[PDB]
Amino acid sequence: TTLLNPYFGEFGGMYVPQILMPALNQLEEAFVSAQKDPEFQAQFADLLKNYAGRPTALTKCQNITAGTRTTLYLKREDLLHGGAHKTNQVLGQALLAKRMGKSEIIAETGAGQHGVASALASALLGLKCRIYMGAKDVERQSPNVFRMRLMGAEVIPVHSGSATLKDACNEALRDWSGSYETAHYMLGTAAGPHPYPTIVREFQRMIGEETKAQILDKEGRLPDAVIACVGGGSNAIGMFADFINDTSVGLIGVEPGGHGIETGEHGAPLKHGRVGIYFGMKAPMMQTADGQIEESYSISAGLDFPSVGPQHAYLNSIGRADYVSITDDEALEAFKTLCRHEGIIPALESSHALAHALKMMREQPEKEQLLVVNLSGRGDKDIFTVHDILKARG
Amino acid sequence: MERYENLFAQLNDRREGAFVPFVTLGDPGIEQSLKIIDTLIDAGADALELGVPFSDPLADGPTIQNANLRAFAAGVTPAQCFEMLALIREKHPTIPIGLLMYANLVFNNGIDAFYARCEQVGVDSVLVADVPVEESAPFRQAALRHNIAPIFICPPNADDDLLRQVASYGRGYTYLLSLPLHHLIEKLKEYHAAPALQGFGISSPEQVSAAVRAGAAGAISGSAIVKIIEKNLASPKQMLAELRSFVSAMKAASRA
Ligand SMILES: *Cc1c(COP(=O)(O)O)cnc(C)c1O
Ligand SMILES: N[C@@H](Cc1c[nH]c2ccccc12)C(=O)O
Ligand SMILES: [Cl-]
Ligand SMILES: [Cl-]
Ligand SMILES: [Cl-]
Ligand SMILES: [Cl-]
Ligand SMILES: [Cl-]
Ligand SMILES: [Cs+]
Ligand SMILES: [Cs+]
Ligand SMILES: [Cs+]
Ligand SMILES: [Cs+]
Ligand SMILES: [Cs+]
Ligand SMILES: [Cs+]
Numbered sequence: 334t335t336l337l338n339p340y341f342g343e344f345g346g347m348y349v350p351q352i353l354m355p356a357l358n359q360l361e362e363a364f365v366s367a368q369k370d371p372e373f374q375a376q377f378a379d380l381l382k383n384y385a386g387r388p389t390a391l392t393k394c395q396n397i398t399a400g401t402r403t404t405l406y407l408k409r410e411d412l413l414h415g416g417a418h419k420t421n422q423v424l425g426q427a428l429l430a431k432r433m434g435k436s437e438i439i440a441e442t443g444a445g446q447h448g449v450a451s452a453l454a455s456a457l458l459g460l461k462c463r464i465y466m467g468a469k470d471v472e473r474q475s476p477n478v479f480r481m482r483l484m485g486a487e488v489i490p491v492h493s494g495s496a497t498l499k500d501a502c503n504e505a506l507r508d509w510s511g512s513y514e515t516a517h518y519m520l521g522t523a524a525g526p527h528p529y530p531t532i533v534r535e536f537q538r539m540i541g542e543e544t545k546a547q548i549l550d551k552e553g554r555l556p557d558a559v560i561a562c563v564g565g566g567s568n569a570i571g572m573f574a575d576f577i578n579d580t581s582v583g584l585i586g587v588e589p590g591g592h593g594i595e596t597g598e599h600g601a602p603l604k605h606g607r608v609g610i611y612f613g614m615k616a617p618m619m620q621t622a623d624g625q626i627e628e629s630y631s632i633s634a635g636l637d638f639p640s641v642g643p644q645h646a647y648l649n650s651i652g653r654a655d656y657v658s659i660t661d662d663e664a665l666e667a668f669k670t671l672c673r674h675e676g677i678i679p680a681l682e683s684s685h686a687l688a689h690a691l692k693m694m695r696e697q698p699e700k701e702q703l704l705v706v707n708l709s710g711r712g713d714k715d716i717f718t719v720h721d722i723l724k725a726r727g
Numbered sequence: 728m729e730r731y732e733n734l735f736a737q738l739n740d741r742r743e744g745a746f747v748p749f750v751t752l753g754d755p756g757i758e759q760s761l762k763i764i765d766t767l768i769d770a771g772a773d774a775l776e777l778g779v780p781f782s783d784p785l786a787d788g789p790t791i792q793n794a795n796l797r798a799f800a801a802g803v804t805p806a807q808c809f810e811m812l813a814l815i816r817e818k819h820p821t822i823p824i825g826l827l828m829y830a831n832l833v834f835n836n837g838i839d840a841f842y843a844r845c846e847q848v849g850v851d852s853v854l855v856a857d858v859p860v861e862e863s864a865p866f867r868q869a870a871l872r873h874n875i876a877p878i879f880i881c882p883p884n885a886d887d888d889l890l891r892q893v894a895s896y897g898r899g900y901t902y903l904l905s906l907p908l909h910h911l912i913e914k915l916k917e918y919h920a921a922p923a924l925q926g927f928g929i930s931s932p933e934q935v936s937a938a939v940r941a942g943a944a945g946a947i948s949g950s951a952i953v954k955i956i957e958k959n960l961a962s963p964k965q966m967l968a969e970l971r972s973f974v975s976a977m978k979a980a981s982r983a
Contacts (some may be wrong), residue, residue, distance in 0.1 A: 335928045359933070370940075373939070431936070432936060432940075433932070433933050433936065434931075434932030434934075434935055434936040434976075434977075434979065434980025435932070435980075436976070436979040436980075514932070514976070515932075515976055515979075557879070656756070
């Protein structure tokens, strides 16, 4: 039994071993209680404003659309403390952990952004933080590992399975099954077993609420579409949530196309996978014919995961949101274009969203359209990646 | 009662709740009980509530009934409990110490004399379990003459007249057993009562945090500690480890 609906249509659920169910039920109860608690909301709002820097800018990008009928705004989650939108929800989850009387935080990370976000929230709020990270990701992300340690977190490499993000995800769940009385599991995206897809949406929904107020102030109407990249789904659902009931507003999620959908080297399960059960949820996933979970690929580690949150699968199934993909090359071109034309270095994750907005403009340059791209993060962290590709390419 | 005033001022400055364990003195023997109490303090108890074994503990449920039986099996007497209280105070000069007493043990050799002994050994409060506010006059009066806070229970079935009496008559803290809870807590503050500690079935960290969120100054674990003693009689070392871990967790939950 639960207080809230664990499903979005057929997607979602609580597919965990029995021993984890009390943990999920306790968290769901604390969340429902927190959401009715003005003091909790005020605490969360205070941290978002005074510590993380909200509200974030909405920037009109003139150079990049010049000579077309597209008006492009960027929601500047790249200006949030920590350099990505992840900070919003880690602060909320850290507050929930404290509401439950917990003293410890467990988190998974692939790209290492979520590990850093978890660590910084733990440092601020006096929680003891431990982070799981696939050994392959550890080796790839030495800067992030060092940041996590500076902020006083423990980083635990994971060598099971494929030694990457899904394996870190499994290990976090393994630890929590033993530790939940004292430790909160700070899941890093809008996926996993209920109640996490619902909590993370609600702790990211200020992105879309601000965007709506800002676009109304600046343009006197709603956007024609809001565009966000989809790795597990948190930034995109945070941008989309407040627009779901504005039926004229398009909701476009961009999955990573990798080397191209046809190569099989991508991370686009919503459009190119099939429904399965993994990570506590029924959701689209990249899988072998016989139902093993596949390895995903993207240039951007932040998008590199073989599944996606269940609310996105649901919004797609009913035709409320549309999902597309952008390849590594398309993302890299958008990254370069934004640096040169607007003086903003975007995350390679966010570059996928921008690339699709650029495609919308370029394909139909005389179409009048008012677009918002969620610029989920900044791309200082990507300059080595980008340097190395450009060099190889000649 | 001044140790309580100092404690609550310190906690208020840290935006923190109090966590207060109960144990029966001398359970399961004097030596082990002293070690238990030292463990509770080192693990972060803010104050203690200590019971003196009585033949007929009317206010007490099965856990504390059994603790009383263990202490009696070890030959524990009130005189021995007062010896223990002196040792505890000697080691720990600032922690508030409350006793949970039955009326006959306070009345036995004279009510004034009992409170004078409390003052001499350094006890800070006394809750007499079978004395309601209506019968409380000589107990409260003797308590205040001896710088002892008289602790009253505010039960779930409390009416407005009772809230006002408990607010007027009590010092140190109000022992809340819970009219809606928010109402009880609000009214106690409105009536300038001693700060409220929620004592109704407090056995998990989340209950400590919820108590503070509700407006209470902290929480009392009336039997959970005793349950740990009971569960681990055969292994004193493991008993201490489990106590330390539990108190640790409960106190962590009280922190801002
Ligand atoms: C982590 C991350 C993502 C992808 O995660 P979502 O949960 O899909 O938002 C996207 N952009 C940035 C900048 C990130 O750090
Ligand atoms: N790999 C990214 C994003 C991420 C965290 N947890 C996830 C779970 C599923 C999908 C993506 C993620 C990071 O760790 O910063
Ligand atoms: Cl509310
Ligand atoms: Cl480094
Ligand atoms: Cl205006
Ligand atoms: Cl539209
Ligand atoms: Cl009692
Ligand atoms: Cs700002
Ligand atoms: Cs334009
Ligand atoms: Cs707390
Ligand atoms: Cs993905
Ligand atoms: Cs991968
Ligand atoms: Cs009083």
